[PDB]
Amino acid sequence: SGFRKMAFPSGKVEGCMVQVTCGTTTLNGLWLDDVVYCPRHVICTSEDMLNPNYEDLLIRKSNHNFLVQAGNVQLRVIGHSMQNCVLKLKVDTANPKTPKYKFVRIQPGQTFSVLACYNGSPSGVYQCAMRPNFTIKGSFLNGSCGSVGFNIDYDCVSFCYMHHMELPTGVHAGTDLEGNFYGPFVDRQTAQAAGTDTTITVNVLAWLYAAVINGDRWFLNRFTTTLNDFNLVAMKYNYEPLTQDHVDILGPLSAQTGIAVLDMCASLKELLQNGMNGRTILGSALLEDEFTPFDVVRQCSG
Amino acid sequence: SGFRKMAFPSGKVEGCMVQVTCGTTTLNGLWLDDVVYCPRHVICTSEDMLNPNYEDLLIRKSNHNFLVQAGNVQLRVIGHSMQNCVLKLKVDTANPKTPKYKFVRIQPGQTFSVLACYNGSPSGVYQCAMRPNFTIKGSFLNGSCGSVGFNIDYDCVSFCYMHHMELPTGVHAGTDLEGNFYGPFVDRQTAQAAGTDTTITVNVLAWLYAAVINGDRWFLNRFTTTLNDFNLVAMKYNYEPLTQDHVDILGPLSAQTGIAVLDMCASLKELLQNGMNGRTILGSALLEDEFTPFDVVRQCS
Numbered sequence: 001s002g003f004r005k006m007a008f009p010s011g012k013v014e015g016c017m018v019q020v021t022c023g024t025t026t027l028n029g030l031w032l033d034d035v036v037y038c039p040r041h042v043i044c045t046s047e048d049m050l051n052p053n054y055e056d057l058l059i060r061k062s063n064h065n066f067l068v069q070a071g072n073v074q075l076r077v078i079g080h081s082m083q084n085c086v087l088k089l090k091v092d093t094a095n096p097k098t099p100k101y102k103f104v105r106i107q108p109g110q111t112f113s114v115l116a117c118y119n120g121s122p123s124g125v126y127q128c129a130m131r132p133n134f135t136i137k138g139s140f141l142n143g144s145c146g147s148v149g150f151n152i153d154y155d156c157v158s159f160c161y162m163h164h165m166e167l168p169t170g171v172h173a174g175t176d177l178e179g180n181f182y183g184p185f186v187d188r189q190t191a192q193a194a195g196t197d198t199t200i201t202v203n204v205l206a207w208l209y210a211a212v213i214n215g216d217r218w219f220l221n222r223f224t225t226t227l228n229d230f231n232l233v234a235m236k237y238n239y240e241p242l243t244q245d246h247v248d249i250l251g252p253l254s255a256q257t258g259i260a261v262l263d264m265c266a267s268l269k270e271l272l273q274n275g276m277n278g279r280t281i282l283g284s285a286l287l288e289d290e291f292t293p294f295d296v297v298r299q300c301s302g
Numbered sequence: 303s304g305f306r307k308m309a310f311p312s313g314k315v316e317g318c319m320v321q322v323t324c325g326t327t328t329l330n331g332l333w334l335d336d337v338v339y340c341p342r343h344v345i346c347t348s349e350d351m352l353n354p355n356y357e358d359l360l361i362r363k364s365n366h367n368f369l370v371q372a373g374n375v376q377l378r379v380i381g382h383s384m385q386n387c388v389l390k391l392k393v394d395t396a397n398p399k400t401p402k403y404k405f406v407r408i409q410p411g412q413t414f415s416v417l418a419c420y421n422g423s424p425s426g427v428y429q430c431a432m433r434p435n436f437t438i439k440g441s442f443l444n445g446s447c448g449s450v451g452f453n454i455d456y457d458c459v460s461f462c463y464m465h466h467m468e469l470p471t472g473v474h475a476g477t478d479l480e481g482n483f484y485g486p487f488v489d490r491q492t493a494q495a496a497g498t499d500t501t502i503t504v505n506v507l508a509w510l511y512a513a514v515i516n517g518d519r520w521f522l523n524r525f526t527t528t529l530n531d532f533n534l535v536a537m538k539y540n541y542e543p544l545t546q547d548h549v550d551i552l553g554p555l556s557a558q559t560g561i562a563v564l565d566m567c568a569s570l571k572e573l574l575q576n577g578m579n580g581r582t583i584l585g586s587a588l589l590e591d592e593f594t595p596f597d598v599v600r601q602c603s
């Protein structure tokens with residue numbers, strides 16, 4: 001019994017973190033086979049943050065300008081390059097601790113584990129959701145950049161995030177490992193705002209099933225409702241629309257608990273409208289949207 | 303910026319995790335040097351859960367009655383002794399993945415990272431507090447037993463918890479690695495009442511200092527108070543006493559934020575008396591007591 005924000009074991013990813021340096025600029029990198037990945041803004045200096053030309057800045061520097069320094073060792077650069085917003089620093093020495101890995105671009109609402117690193121040292125691990133506005137509510141300090149988000153699928157590490165920057169609002173923005181930003185963000189010191197942070201409705205329903213499964217089921221109501229009726233309520237409270245896929249994806253939890261999806265939607269409508277009258281669900285004063293239906297099965301079944 | 307329930311990288315602990323079978327019963331062990339630690343209740347059937355005798359059950363068993371499996375590998379058991387509520391199985395092989403480690407007994411209000419394990423396989427990692435009533439609100443399913451809690455210090459792992467059982471309330475009971483239960487709990491299937499759990503006052507205070515450090519300043523009032531005046535309100539709302547050591551520990555934060563500990567003490571009292579009014583601090587609509595003053599400093603500096 002019990003239910004917690006659980007990350008994946010960070011072992012396999014600890015052995016992939018490296019320190020990368022260009023002049024005063026020192027940040028984290030990911031070392032997989034004969035390639036080191038980091039954010040391209042390692043080549044930028046405080047003079048060229050307002051409006052950098054990354055092609056042009058890369059020209060200034062060459063293979064030997066990159067201090068790819070791995071746990072007190074040194075690595076030789078055999079051919080750098082630029083993939084959108086990340087550098088592929090080709091090393092001679094392949095990483096012997098390379099897990100079976102894959103690069104994925106995760107959809108908004110999907111969760112992942114972050115290994116927060118400073119100077120290439122695994123510093124801490126926490127679970128995160130890709131917000132609908134393509135930000136993450138993380139925990140990052142200066143030199144965090146290059147810290148990675150990953151999901152472990154058996155023996156296969158699926159890297160989905162590389163941390164780049166914090167926005168004026170204090171939330172965080174990054175890229176897949178092919179260097180494409182999530183959301184409309186760019187790697188320059190400009191006025192950037194995230195859109196409306198809507199609530200991930202399908203995740204909140206997963207978490208309620210999770211609560212029932214623990215025996216914390218006071219909120220269960222004597223009502224029902226419809227997708228259309230529920231969505232009109234959802235929109236008013238800036239909850240993501242609930243689609244039929246999202247009803248189907250909640251299939252397994254509907255099965256065990258014996259409580260239909262719409263009745264769970266019916267119980268959620270009340271809590272949105274009536275608040276929680278000072279009560280709690282799984283020791284939480286508010287509705288948690290940072291657990292996918294997969295995350296709940298994983299933890300409530302093995 | 304930003305502030306989260308963070309755990310320590312689990313990698314140095316993953317290499318210490320092993321499976322232990324004895325009869326039908328399977329759980330997790332901790333393989334450090336040539337010793338494998340696990341909960342001693344691995345020797346008990348469904349017929350000896352109410353009231354087992356762990357001396358008259360151990361006696362009946364021998365080295366080869368114990369399967370120790372490290373990943374896909376098998377370990378030769380050449381010894382078995384009982385220390386309080388842990389088994390210590392001597393094996394033919396030093397774990398070459400053994401980190402520099404320590405066994406520490408941890409105090410209530412203290413936090414640690416747990417690596418939840420099933421059949422010797424690291425399944426997940428989360429930060430967890432030793433609660434006043436010596437329970438933990440963890441996440442553990444059948445076969446989670448022998449999963450361990452730990453703090454990490456540069457390269458030196460501090461083992462503090464081993465999980466043993468779930469109480470009929472859903473909260474969890476375990477030992478230090480020397481086999482002594484935190485709290486009055488016993489490894490059998492009897493009526494066992496968790497003490498009434500208080501709030502970890504000093505931790506809530508460090509949480510507010512974190513909030514302030516992120517820019518959340520709305521709960522800061524014009525008032526001040528005293529250790530005694532505050533402690534009176536503390537005991538009232540089932541909050542642990544605040545002590546001078548507690549105030550000393552909070553200094554680094556106090557100095558950083560410019561807010562003297564007794565001023566933050568005053569602000570806390572006004573949230574306790576007035577409630578939070580639907581308002582939120584660091585994304586939380588109730589007061590968080592599961593970050594220590596160390597946890598904040600690590601995460602905020």
Ligand SMILES: */C=C\C(=O)N(c1ccc(-c2ccccc2)cc1)[C@@H](C(=O)N[C@@H](C)c1ccccc1)c1cccnc1
Nearest residue numbers: 041044049140141142143144145165166187188189303
């Ligand atoms: C990894 C560095 C870092 O920690 N931050 C950061 C500094 C500078 C850049 C940058 C340099 C040159 C060209 C483009 C970008 C990127 C990241 C900071 C951070 O994100 N600061 C914000 C305000 C920033 C700086 C520059 C451009 C846009 C935005 C940071 C701070 C806290 C947590 N994570 C990162």
Ligand SMILES: */C=C\C(=O)N(c1ccc(-c2ccccc2)cc1)[C@H](C(=O)N[C@@H](C)c1ccccc1)c1cccnc1
Nearest residue numbers: 001343346351442443444445446447466467468489490
């Ligand atoms: C290690 C296996 C368990 O998960 N587990 C357990 C605890 C104690 C014994 C035992 C002790 C003394 C003598 C004989 C046997 C055996 C197994 C427990 C457990 O059994 N929990 C029960 C209370 C339970 C709760 C909720 C749902 C199903 C069962 C356990 C179970 C889950 C998490 N941690 C521990």
